[PDB]
Amino acid sequence: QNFLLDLRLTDKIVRKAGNLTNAYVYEVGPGPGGITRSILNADVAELLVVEKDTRFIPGLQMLSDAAPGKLRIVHGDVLTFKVEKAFSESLKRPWEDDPPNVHIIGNLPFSVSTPLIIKWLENISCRDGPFVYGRTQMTLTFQKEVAERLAANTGSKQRSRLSVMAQYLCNVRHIFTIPGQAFVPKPEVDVGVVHFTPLIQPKIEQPFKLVEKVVQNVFQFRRKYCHRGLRMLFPEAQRLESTGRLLELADIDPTLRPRQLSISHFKSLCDVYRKMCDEDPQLFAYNFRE
RNA sequence: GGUAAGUGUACUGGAAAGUGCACUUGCC
Ligand SMILES: C[S@@+](CC[C@H](N)C(=O)[O-])C[C@H]1O[C@@H](n2cnc3c(N)ncnc32)[C@H](O)[C@@H]1O
């Protein structure tokens, strides 16, 4: 659909990924090759590129004809391509060390990228997937609005769910947006650029699907008091007493609003919710739609 | 109150944009 061909920009992106000399990179959805021409020009060790659409191959291969052995083009679907088997076991560096010599770079349709960052976020929770090499970093691409929420801060206008879901597992710099006018063809949206480094110590240590559930119910009624959406974690019968103990033990003023909660206010609540989940087995599958 | 355009707007973990709401106007 909408492609990025401006060398000034494709360069700026690969610059904002970090030093890439003799590194290994996985570019998702290379497309016409703008991003990957620039990647190739950062003297990398090898660039693996996975692309769903066969017709971008002739052109992508002209780029590899220009840098032989540097570019490995793989005909694959990003949402199912198992990158963990894609590079040498040699590059696995431990989680407390520095990020491995492995980087992800992507400019995919927002249709694909948004779900991807979700399945990749829990991949970081579990330290599997692309993160078997351990705290591998990512440079990807979202509609300016979505880029904003990912990096939004406690109290910001656009502090939403992916604020919490991304920041508790990662350091999340949203380092610049670019105008839709820069794209062939220009969409009626601006485009934003976010970098992720997986956090050594995550800001919350509970199963991903737990704080996925917890953060959801908070941001449910986004400008009301937090307790009014929270309380829906609990079936009608227990709901009053339960919500009390939860806010009590977690130490949260219920007048607080979802956008005002510290990334640690969340750690607080989930620890308490995990406790009362393990004290009541039939509680974590409760959802009000019933 | 029903529809179309406009303008605001809210929400979005379906955002290369979508939908909901409000108001005004034209027509019914
Ligand atoms: C909006 S175009 C952008 C073109 C190019 N990536 C760029 O930055 O200029 C997105 C590209 O991602 C690819 N793509 C979309 N879904 C994909 C998927 N599931 N797996 C691999 N590639 C995908 C498409 O083939 C297309 O080439």
Numbering used by the authors: 35 to 324
Give verbatim lines from the article.
Mitochondrial transcription factor B1 (TFB1M) is a dimethyltransferase that maintains mitochondrial homeostasis by catalyzing dimethylation of two adjacent adenines located in helix45 (h45) of 12S rRNA. This m62A modification is indispensable for the assembly and maturation of human mitochondrial ribosomes. TFB1M was originally thought to serve as a transcription factor along with TFB2M but has instead been shown to be a dimethyltransferase with the main role of m62A modification of the 3′ end of mitochondrial 12S rRNA. To clarify the mechanism of m62A modification, we determined the crystal structures of a ternary complex of human (hs) TFB1M (hsTFB1M–h45–SAM) and a binary complex (hsTFB1M–h45) both at 3.0 Å resolution.
The structure of the ternary complex (hsTFB1M–h45–SAM) clearly showed how the substrate RNA, h45, interacts with hsTFB1M. In the structure, h45 folded into a hairpin structure capped with a typical four-nucleotide ‘GGAA’ tetraloop and was suspended from hsTFB1M, stretching across its N-terminal and C-terminal domains. As a typical SAM-dependent methyltransferase, hsTFB1M exhibited a conserved negatively-charged SAM-binding pocket surrounded by Glu85, Lys86, Asp111, Val112, Asn141, Leu142 and Val146, whose primary role was establishing hydrogen bonding and hydrophobic interactions. Two hydroxyl groups in the ribose moiety of SAM formed bidentate hydrogen bonds with the carboxyl group of Glu85. In the structure of the hsTFB1M–h45–SAM ternary complex, SAM lay in a conserved acidic pocket immediately adjacent to the m.937A pocket in order to present the SAM methyl group to one of the two N6H atoms in m.937A. Moreover, the active-site pocket, formed by the highly-conserved residues Gln35, Asn36, Asn141, Phe144 and Val225, could only accommodate one nucleotide of h45. Thus, the process of m62A modification is possibly the same with m6A, during which the enzyme active center only accommodates one adenine and one SAM methyl group simultaneously.
